[PDB]
């Protein structure tokens, strides 16, 4: 598995959060999301009927996988990691199992993950996938209904508004009929997958976690799995901000990654213009890299499928700083 | 009789909304000027590509009733909407031109009609803005004689899809689009209190008289702004730099940030106190404040615009009890 | 009677002001954390250099009367000032330590004395904040046992001028500076309604009891916040994360931007509506809102803080007539 | 005069606005200056007695000419131009003729212009001077009392509050007793002066302009004089924004300069965080340079004598962009 050597020297990856949440852009009926605009459905308890209707308005005329991959490559990013399905349960690929997806439900009627997979394959960039294996707000038995004594970036971890009957919920039904089928689809279509990125599990049993692990192993032997799946079921450690060294979980292969966003939201938010400066981005990358940690830097695409102007500017200027610094 | 009402109106909402709103001040990694609604001229976007934005126009949250409720809660007594801006895209159902919000967009609804009705019901007067000179969708759109002066885009006219300047002839555009479209908006959509025209550059004296007489005939009580032509108006539109003939009616238009059209990158919202003080200064001088909102791609008043309007009203009411 | 008064006070102004204010969130081309007042720890600025800021402290526009006028106009019934923060610089005339605003600065005036008088005259209650544990100017300042937890600076203690951790001894600092200074502020400056202590880390249970008894003796009617020590307080200081004590007295402290001390780079001012709604939510739960202002180097309430406080009050009054 | 050849290839200069205005930082009694914070005295008609008292609070502990010149040089700036005296009439050098200066009136009790002159001399950077030869709000006969049919960045062009009797004013008294003496001082002390930068004249006679021209010529033979002095009395043209070429006043030596600021104020302003991005700064510089026009980019020092953090970041990132570009 050359992927271990490659990942230890990759240093830099682009992450992409994009979905129906992007159309609301951090705002609902005159009121603000939390820092996390992608959590807006939970934040305002938007019924599935209304939220899902955003699919009818999803027509990102300027989306261009080739150009997004070109930007990542120009910044020295060696891989890319996209939301296949976030907490809202809306798939960004053509899902045989669930018609609640970007291909079937939207006038755009295209496979975002497929286009990025191809663009990456052509450019020489590795391709990785993010799936919300626990939380799913579209599913009556979506996870997080046992976790609501801890506050969130929305209201509840689960969809507790369309599905109020907590005691009647049963994650097994959602796992068996949606999660595992969808994981099999994304790990089967879309070619070689370098990296698999799972959410923080809360509802999943040890059994259900082992299943996902074995499934990925079988379908994508050379895929590196992040630590957020389950203990002993990963190839690299995802470090939270509170876990970076100054200037735990064992790492058997010596592989590490911290994910960040350029402003304070993962999803696009009109109101969030708090973009980290080129120098902040470059310095943070250099500090992680010096500690043998990969920087996975999020872009939140806008409703027309564009990298925000200020995100693009700050990525390119951080690269100019880095290249200047690395001569001498 | 609208003369008495207009002298005491004090406060109006203006609305800029169109295909420009979907691009939201940004095109291929670059910024519009302060005026996001000028973005097509700014980047010389071909009509084929720009017009295609119509296919993506589906503002799920647009709600005329709620927009008029906000205006009325702020003490605004009237509302003035873009029926067609410089891009030449009509925001009503135009018999004359299929390049409109009803025929060209999946939303497939008449924005002006809905606002007209909401206004009528709420007791708010209704006014219309039409670009009678500039039209970037029309081969003979105006501004092809005016390009020795800089703009909020590139050229005043569409000089990219229509490069042959000397072969242009505004009469064809005036006769076949401008005057027909003015007749439609002044015929459908009920009583019109206010008619708001752009800065004329190409229009002849004749063409200006025609528009004046047309509005007079179709909408006898409609007050016409000074930007049409000298001696062809009922009230003066003052620029900020002009606050000191009027046969005694006056209006200054402003926007809450620095753009008329919606712009993601422009978060330079004037504070409640700025909005209230400016209103009080204009009002004290017998001048109406026409305050622009630029609706977002889902048809929403931006959160910060709504907050600042409501807080300015709270300041004004507090002040007016002292 | 202070118990009854505090349960119905609802609203207080807090003030963070010191040498930190002159650096204003910036040191040698780099940013403080969100907490600009922690800047000395953040950059490990030696006492010799940091203390030299005293030579530049000349806030020509400081005006206790006007600051109290603003607080009173916003319905604030009390005021709470930093007498000495973590940097160990007293903002009153301290007999015990020459490292104070009177002796060390050209301004050569007693900030706490002026505010005490302005409050007394306006009918506003007066409260004092003292850092009883951390003191970065003192060789035996607290926090040298707490550095396995990260801070808004580097270390909790001054570990740069005073590196030898194992040789430090908080008793020397407590006996010779903390308790003397607490006695001064609780003796001069008249009746004290409220005593606001920092989160203790180094203090013994004994040292906490001493402060409690000292305040009780010198200022019998002073209400003491919960941050002193368990069973040694009259009201609970709640963090936001602690909203769903025997006298039923509660207070949550907040700042208008994200810093307690003034920071030129921090323009993230909470909107009037955010401020008003948060106040209303705390008040509905029987919790007092203590809202921080961070005075600028000339002793001014920042323009945007003043605007947002006044607009929040206008929203509140409008709402409370509905 | 090698200065003509040198100026045609200089491309890039730092400008500095700094004075009592800097302490008020765009704010007075709860209210905002215009975009131009340095005009704040006119904006609020602050009496000379109160405004001048700011001198007592002027103690910029962090001012460091050596470091400011280091920054300019790191950004490829080949010269530096400082306010010796702006419209407020407060000199930033030790003036024999007027005690209303940074040396005599302030506890800092040092010569800003002298320190920068020396730092520049040592670093190999040319040194230029800005003097307000017309407007002077401290002087009873300061200019602009004939010009108040045009609006300003303050209230009136002249100090019309301390000196209300417009018809009794006489600029000759101010010119003879302050302007020309002060110009002689700055052109005599402070070594070789590469560039002389005058304000837009409104009150000055043709005679008074000729005098300044001849004075500079005699005292500083190789000093290049900007066009804002008087027609036929200049070596290079100062172009206003509205005069830059696309996709007048003749220039006999073919010398051109446009001055700009990084935010929207020349003087420091707390409230103005509208910093032009690295890419804006670099692109504008490249466009001017391609047209043989020098870019004179203003920094407005803060009350402690610091280059604002975001101004320093944007200058350095613009340089990184420029160097990256110039290797492509
Ligand atoms: C990448 C993000 O992950 C989760 O929330 C977290 C969980 C862990 C961290 N972390 O510590 O880096 C940050 C956000 C999601 O809830 C969020 O919407 C986004 O997808
Ligand atoms: C209401 C605005 O008017 C026009 O442009 C202007 C705006 C103001 C003036 N004025 O008053 O100077 C002149 C042209 C339009 O170009 C702009 O997009 C918007 O429609
Ligand atoms: C009022 C603030 O108090 C402390 O910081 C804290 C410490 C603990 C909490 N808390 O846990 O509620 C809040 C602020 C100080 O560090 C800070 O400078 C400011 O004075
Ligand atoms: C460098 C600047 O010069 C003047 O302001 C200007 C500058 C340029 C023009 N111009 O070209 O129109 C008008 C006023 C001064 O008023 C300002 O404070 C600063 O010193």
Residue numbers in the entry:
A (entry chain A), D (entry chain D): 2 to 248, 265 to 345
B (entry chain G): 3 to 246, 267 to 269, 271 to 345
C (entry chain E): 3 to 246, 268 to 345
Can I see the authors' text?
Lactobacillus casei produces a GH29A α-fucosidase, AlfC, that is ~104-fold more active on α(1-6)-fucosyl linkages compared to other linkages. This enzyme is particularly relevant because α(1-6) linkages form the basis of human core fucosylation, which significantly impacts the function of glycoproteins such as antibodies. AlfC is a single-domain enzyme that adopts a (β/α)8 fold typical of GH29 enzymes, with an active site at the center of the barrel. Our results suggest that AlfC employs a conserved hydrolytic mechanism with a specific subsite that accommodates GlcNAc in α(1,6)-linkages, while AlfC tranfucosidase mutants work by shifting equilibrium between open and closed conformations of an active-site loop.
We soaked this substrate into apo AlfCD200A crystals and observed clear electron density for it. However, despite the bound substrate, we observed no conformational changes in any of the acid/base candidates, and the Cα of D200A and D242 were still ~16.5 Å apart. 4NP-fuc bound in an orientation nearly identical to that seen in BT2970, where the Cα of the nucleophile and acid/base are separated by ~12.5 Å, in a conformation compatible with catalysis. In BiAfcB, it has been observed that the Cα of the acid/base can move from ~17.6 Å away from the nucleophile Cα, to only ~12.1 Å away. The same conformational change in AlfC would place the Cα of D242 only ~11 Å from the nucleophile Cα, in a position compatible with catalysis. Therefore, structural homology suggests the existence of open and closed states of AlfC.
